Write a protein that binds this ligand. Structure first.
Ligand SMILES: [Mg+2]
Lengths: 80, 140, 82, 59, 166, 148, 275, 101
């Protein structure tokens, strides 16, 4: 069956198009140039990756405690 | 029969208790009860959305009735109250309409006052000072 | 002379803003009914269901009985609010 | 306000009689008005299960 | 098997105080393992429900169903034991408060069919139960009047609350 | 489900908050066992927290009965006659403390579906709406199409 | 047979529960059930109500005369609560009268008396005692405690509170536990009246006002089986009160009731009680 | 949420409030205060000096067990969960207004 476009649908599409046109405008004016931006975030990016690597390589089984082992004896703790 | 189940009575009852108020064998036979009880629980879970949806629909209908009693339309009432910065929700508006007719008439009067203040601004846009009730309180 | 709504019914509404303009006062005293707007006090199953339907402007269907199933499902001690 | 419970409920849920004059009126608009009144959608206490309909007499 | 109906006659109530209404006598009787379908016996039971003992006997004496004779014998025995043992003053002052038929212990037999196939006949047996209560039969429930119908409708209208609101 | 369950309306016991707040819980009864892992938590609760709870809630009479039992229990009896029995079987000290505090703070009314989240005995101050509110009156109260 | 014990025990428990539900045992006073200590219970009663009762007075209040008679009869094979109950009843009546007269100065003496009678009646006081646990601590020769005995014990408790803490604390107690019982109630729900139109005529005569004229303000479906009539009472062409009804007579009666409520200041939208 | 409230009213908040039972509280976001003959509307909130709504934590409870069941046909997909939402019943003691207009 055929489908037809209503004025509401046209208005919705036009609203989206206006938003996208404003997006075009605001993207049309960069702050820095590419040569200016080159390398300006290298230190932070390297530190972030170093943190990721440290987290990846710090994976190791957790400690085990005599207190944890012995506390199970309390299951038969009673009143004298 | 080393290991044989002995709780099957209670396992069946856990479902039959919920099935007790059904019609026909669905309330007695477990094979039939379990299928309908699962459907009942699924419907109960999904009905929490429809309860909220219908409450707003009921509130909107009641507010429409109350506003039409004063010659207003629901969109006008709601929009103009918002423009006046009265943040009463639809539940409260319907409650006021049912139980506080005078307060609801006052609110409808405010909405119509704003709706006419709005129109005067549109006609003589610019020079005209903002309407008394059109002035917006600023928060910082 | 402008009135936000007709003042004849249910109260006389008067809107206002406080001097600060941050709160809205509504004065809505109820309007009494004028004395002149009042009047002085004056001084078989088939046929039965038809009569009841005519009386209460309903249909025949609600006057027929229901089965024991429904009559016993009905809650005889419903919760009461207010 | 200040009514007893039964009189208050009776007043709230009473059904009113409305009169429409169909002379030169569109049957569709007449029907819209009559349907609103019959359903009771013109009452703030409206609910589908409250049987809050009113009487409409169209001449 | 269950035999609670017979035991129901052995319950002894405490003596009644002088300022207490006279408790009507109740007699529980039954016949077990009647060669008759419980479905067919149910019609006779329903027929005699709520009727006086004499009216029930009269109705059963002129019924062509085999179960009618059995029910008549059971009712006569119930009357006799009510007078002899349950201290019922008048034979005729009894009405059938309860009368039902129950499934009995049935036997399975083979019914031969045409092509070497078969069915499982059931030699159906049924129980019959009666409770006889002393006193005139309770009056039949009068039909709902228009006044009562209107009263119920108006009560339903008055019961309406403003739903889903304050 | 709601349809397969009783329901009630939001309510108090005796208008519990109007004049003064009266703690509805009145009795606690802890059946605990000297021996048995099930009641280890109950025993620790009786040793450490029960006295503090008793002095914090002076209006609640707390009975502690040490008898052989496989499932230690706490029976809470409220002023309105409600009796709620909760098993403290294999519950830790903190779990028992939270359960007992919940019982103390809770009212005797049944824990079932509540139809409305609110309850007003006077829902209307300006007069409940009726069909004739907002309807203007007419001279001599003449109905429409009335000759006189 | 299936080996095991836990399922059998559970089924026995369920059978016991079902048997109890089908044939619940006759009610027994809480004193005869396990986990009962009378001294602890009475102290907790006082602490719950947040009042410094004197234990001897409270015990004397809780003990009834019929209990003493039954105890003596049993012993064959104590100070009753009579005076405390009398003092409590007298003080409660006077204090409720003072409260109601202060709140509703226009209410007639008959109306105030009827309101006090409702608040101190068997039903209201019995409900309050039951939900305050007075019945549990009440010593009586039969259970459940009859409403008369429960009311007497409750007023004995009030008298003990009076003797312990004083009139001010007792008045606060009464305000908290009896004045609250008229919240949500209607004036003529509490004070039953007959011929409200006649009573309103009498009140207007006392106020030196001509008899009101009953007039039909609004009506609907007059000839149907579900009519609505609004009847307004007019004082010299001034509406004093209008009421709805099914018939004109019922509407007029309800309008008279509304007028009485407005005159006595017990309107539905009246100022709340102050706590 | 917005609650239409009056003295002696009961309100059921669907969460624990971290308040002891019987503790008195002031409700501060009062959008509207109304009487028989007048109403005051905030924009959107009335000032503290104008209205003083006071409540009391009358009870702390858990809601009745709510069932959350998921089911998809012919997928062996069936799940059940029971949730008891914490709740607090508040009683509104008084609503006071002051001549600060
Ligand atoms: Mg053959």
């Amino acid at each position: 069956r055929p489908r037809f476009v209503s004025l509401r649908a046209k208005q919705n599409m036009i609203r989206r198009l206006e938003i996208e046109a404003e997006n075009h405008y605001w993207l049309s004016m960069p702050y820095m140039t590419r040569e200016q931006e080159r390398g300006h975030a290298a230190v932070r990016r390297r530190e972030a990756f170093e943190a990721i690597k440290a987290a990846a390589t710090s994976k190791f089984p957790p400690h085990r405690f005599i207190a944890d082992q012995l506390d199970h004896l309390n299951v038969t703790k009673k009143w004298s | 029969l080393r290991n044989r189940v002995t709780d099957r009575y209670f396992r069946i009852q856990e479902v039959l208790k919920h099935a007790r108020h059904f019609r026909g064998r669905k309330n007695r036979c477990y094979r039939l009860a379990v299928r309908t009880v699962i459907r009942a629980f699924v419907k109960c879970t999904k009905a929490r959305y429809l309860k909220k949806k219908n409450m707003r629909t009921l509130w909107i209908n009641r507010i429409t009735a109350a506003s039409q009693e004063h010659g207003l339309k629901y969109p006008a009432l709601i929009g103009n109250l918002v423009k006046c910065q009265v943040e009463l929700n639809r539940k409260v508006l319907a409650d006021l309409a049912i139980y506080e007719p005078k307060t609801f008439k006052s609110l409808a009067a405010l909405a119509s006052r704003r709706r006419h203040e709005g129109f005067a601004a549109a006609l003589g846009d610019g020079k005209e000072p903002e309407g008394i009730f059109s002035r917006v309180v600023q928060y910082h | 002379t402008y009135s936000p709504l007709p003042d004849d019914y249910n109260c006389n509404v008067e809107l206002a803003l406080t001097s600060d303009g941050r709160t809205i006062v509504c004065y809505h005293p109820s309007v009494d009914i004028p004395y002149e707007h009042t009047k002085p006090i004056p001084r078989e199953e088939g046929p039965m269901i038809e009569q009841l339907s005519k009386m209460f402007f309903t249909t025949k269907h609600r006057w027929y009985p229901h089965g024991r199933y429904h009559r016993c499902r009905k809650n005889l001690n419903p919760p009461k609010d207010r | 306000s200040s009514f007893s419970r039964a009189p208050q409920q009776w007043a709230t849920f009473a059904r009113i009689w409305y009169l429409l004059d169909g002379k030169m009126q569109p049957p569709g608009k007449l029907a819209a008005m009559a349907s609103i009144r019959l359903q009771g959608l013109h009452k703030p206490v409206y609910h589908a299960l409250s049987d809050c309909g009113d009487h409409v007499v169209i001449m | 098997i269950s035999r609670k109906w017979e035991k129901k006659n052995k319950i002894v109530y405490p003596p009644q105080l002088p300022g207490e209404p006279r408790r009507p006598a109740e007699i529980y009787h039954c016949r077990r393992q009647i060669k008759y379908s419980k479905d067919k016996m149910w019609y006779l039971a329903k027929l005699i429900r709520g009727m006086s003992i004499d009216q029930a006997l009269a109705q059963l004496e002129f019924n062509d169903k085999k179960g009618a004779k059995i029910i008549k014998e059971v009712l006569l025995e119930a009357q006799d034991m009510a007078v002899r043992d349950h201290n019922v003053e008048f034979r005729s002052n009894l009405y059938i408060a309860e009368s039902t038929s129950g499934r009995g212990q049935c036997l399975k037999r083979i019914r031969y069919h045409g092509r070497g196939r078969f069915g499982i006949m059931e030699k159906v047996y049924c129980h019959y139960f009666v409770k006889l209560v002393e006193g005139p039969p309770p009056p039949p429930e009068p039909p709902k009047t228009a006044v009562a119908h209107a009263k119920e409708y108006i009560q339903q209208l008055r019961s309406r609350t403003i739903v889903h609101t304050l | 489900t709601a349809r397969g369950t009783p329901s009630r309306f939001l309510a108090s016991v005796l208008h519990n908050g109007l004049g003064r707040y009266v703690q509805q819980l009145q009795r606690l009864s802890f059946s605990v066992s000297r021996d048995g892992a099930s009641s280890r938590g109950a025993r620790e609760f009786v040793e450490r927290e029960v006295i503090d709870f008793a002095r914090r809630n002076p209006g609640v009479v707390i009975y502690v009965n040490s008898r052989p039992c496989c499932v230690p229990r706490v029976v809470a009896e409220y002023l309105n006659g409600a009796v709620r029995e909760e098993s403290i079987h294999c519950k830790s000290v903190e779990e028992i403390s939270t359960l007992v505090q919940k019982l103390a703070d809770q009212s005797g009314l049944d824990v079932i579906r509540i139809r409305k989240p609110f309850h007003t005995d006077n829902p209307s101050i300006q007069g409940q709406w009726h069909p004739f509110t907002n309807k203007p009156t007419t001279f001599r109260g003449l109905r429409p199409r009335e000759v006189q | 047979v299936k080996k095991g014990f836990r399922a059998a025990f559970r089924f026995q428990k369920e059978l016991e529960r079902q048997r109890l539900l089908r044939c619940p045992p006759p009610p027994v006073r809480r004193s005869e059930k396990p986990n009962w200590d009378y001294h602890a219970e009475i102290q907790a009663f006082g602490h719950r109500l947040q009042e410094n009762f004197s234990l001897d007075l409270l015990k004397t209040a809780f003990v009834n005369s019929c209990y003493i008679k039954s105890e003596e009869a049993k012993r064959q094979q104590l100070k009753s609560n009579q005076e405390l109950s009398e003092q409590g009843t007298s003080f409660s009546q006077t204090c409720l009268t003072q409260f109601l007269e202060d709140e509703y100065p226009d209410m007639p003496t008959e109306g105030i008396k009827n309101l006090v009678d409702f608040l101190t009646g068997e039903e209201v006081v019995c409900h309050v005692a039951r939900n305050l646990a007075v019945e549990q601590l009440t010593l009586s020769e039969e259970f459940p405690v009859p409403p008369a005995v429960l009311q007497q014990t409750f007023f004995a408790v009030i008298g003990a509170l009076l003797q312990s803490s004083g009139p001010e604390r007792t008045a606060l107690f009464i305000r908290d536990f009896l004045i609250t019982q008229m919240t949500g109630k209607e004036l003529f729900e509490m004070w039953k009246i007959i011929n409200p139109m006649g009573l309103l005529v009498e009140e207007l005569k006392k106020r030196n006002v001509s008899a009101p004229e009953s007039r039909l303000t609004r009506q609907s479906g007059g000839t149907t089986a579900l009519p609505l009539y609004f009847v307004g009472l007019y004082c010299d062409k001034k509406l004093i009160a209008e009421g709805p009804g099914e018939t004109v007579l019922v509407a007029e009666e309800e309008a008279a009731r509304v007028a009485l409520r407005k005159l006595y200041g017990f309107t539905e939208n009246r100022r709340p009680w102050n706590y | 949420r917005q609650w239409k409230v009056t003295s002696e009213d009961l309100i059921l908040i669907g969460n624990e409030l971290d308040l002891a039972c019987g503790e008195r509280i002031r409700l501060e976001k009062v959008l509207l205060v109304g009487a028989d003959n007048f109403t005051l509307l905030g924009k959107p909130l009335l000032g503290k000096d104008l209205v003083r709504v006071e409540a009391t934590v009358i009870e702390k409870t858990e809601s009745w067990p709510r069932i959350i069941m998921r089911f998809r046909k012919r997928k062996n997909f069936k799940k059940k969960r029971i949730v008891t939402t914490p709740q607090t019943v508040l009683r509104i003691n008084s609503i006071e207004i002051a001549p600060c207009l």
